[model samples]
Target: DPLTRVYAKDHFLRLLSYQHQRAFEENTPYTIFFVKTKVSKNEREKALMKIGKILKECVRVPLDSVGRYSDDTFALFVIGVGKETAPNIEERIKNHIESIGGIEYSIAYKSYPEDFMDLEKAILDLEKAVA
Candidate 1:
């Protein structure tokens, strides 16, 4: 369901790079949220398909973009946001997915260009968040 991942591969790269530049120049916090949805083996394939569509629709916002990093997980890159707004955003995302019939999910996030000086390290921190 790469078609429903919202951002095409190149678009996702440009979007992230743009955010990285903004974070560096404006000193605003940029956060990446990696979310994974789970379901029973019997329903896994279908659940994942639905989650892809749900995520694509849910992340269409001025400061947000989403991409499928793999079959079972999606990554959201949100800029101009900080810890103060993370809780609300998280809830919004959760509710949005629920409304679309998505079941269980996990969220992991890292703030960037604030916690780290460079883009590469920021991405590494995002990976660490999932760990």
Candidate 2:
């Protein structure tokens, strides 16, 4: 497993802005993905952790960062990746679960071509949906 720091809540948002600005200035596009897992309460915590670890390490995609958006929700940041290619990352992500999911999951993603505000609304709705 990678010994990298998973940005906590506030810090993740800070980085999001950095990517947003840099993406615009540099004409690079990044994608944010929200993955929500559903499993029985007892094992769910461990399940999510395992899923997250698998999330970052599974295929070694261009995952820029990971965050525990909340309980069972995760926000995956893929740096300098565009919307068209975002699915390639998700495809790899699915490979593991496809390869392996007592942990049922749901996913959604946003790109700045997706509009930053759209992501805020997108993520906000996810927070509402999952909460």
Candidate 3:
């Protein structure tokens, strides 16, 4: 439930970069997902809260590595999982959101050592996908 502000996201990214490096060395893969919501300011908080709950339930991992990228955007870092599993989780989140109604959002994800060789490039690619 750690939702970082824009200022703190850079620090989190650095930490993730370090984790990514270790993941690379250990032959473990991780996925980073960017969830961006399309809602008015009045509904943004509620929408994000619902989305966060959906992610928390969907992730099912011991470490919930979800971060708030901005007021209307959130990021999830799924560690120790294969590249193939990311999309399945994304689909589940999307399905859950659709089921909940009154919320619209898009999800973009990239996997480490599968999509990019470096953490910086992977993050850049994820940003581009969501943008």
Candidate 4:
């Protein structure tokens, strides 16, 4: 049910953008992981489902906050966990993705209070990181 209830692509990005803005404004710490996939349309749905499951099993709190940022990209926001834990969280997700197999993807992450103070820049940086 968590998967079914996730934010749609555009809305997800908007929410993420807003969250980044708020974090920057409040000088709070937050982490956002951008996951981009390179797969055929026929495989996208299955890949998204598997990715969702991996996130649910791997992440801590905010487990259900996975969002579809594009046709082949998803985003996960972790509030209050500083930049230090971003790599570890990303690795956990990578390990899960490997277990699922058959899908090709890249992950890039950015953390607030350490990366950028501008929400737009933070979002753009993550997008480039995954690229």
TM-score of 2: 0.81
lDDT of 4 by residue, 1-131 (tens): 55345778777777777766667678778887888988788998889888876665544554326777777788888777687887888889898888878889999877777876676787788888887
Ranking by TM-score: 3, 4, 2, 1
Task: Give the local distance difference test score of model 3.
Answer: 0.73
* Tens digits of per-residue lDDT for model 1, 62-131: 6578876655667777776677776677777778777867477776766674456576676666656554
lDDT of 3 by residue, 90-123 (tens): 8888898999898877788887777877767777
Q: Which ten residues in a row have the lowest lDDT in candidate 1?
A: 1-10
Off by over 4 Å in 2: 1-3, 58-63, 114-119, 125-131
TM-score between candidate 4 and the true structure: 0.82
- Write one digit per residue (lDDT tens) for candidate 2, span 1-131: 33455778778777777777777788777887778887778988777777688667632343377888778788777777677888887787777766665668877777666545455675787565545
Score residue 34 of candidate 4 by CA lDDT.
Answer: 84
lDDT against the true structure, per candidate, is 0.68, 0.71, 0.73, 0.76
Instruction: Identify the candidate with maximal lDDT.
Output: 4
Give the clash count for each candidate: 0, 2, 0, 0
TM-score of each candidate structure, all chains considered together: 0.68, 0.81, 0.83, 0.82
User: Residue 61 error for model 2, in Å?
Assistant: 9.2
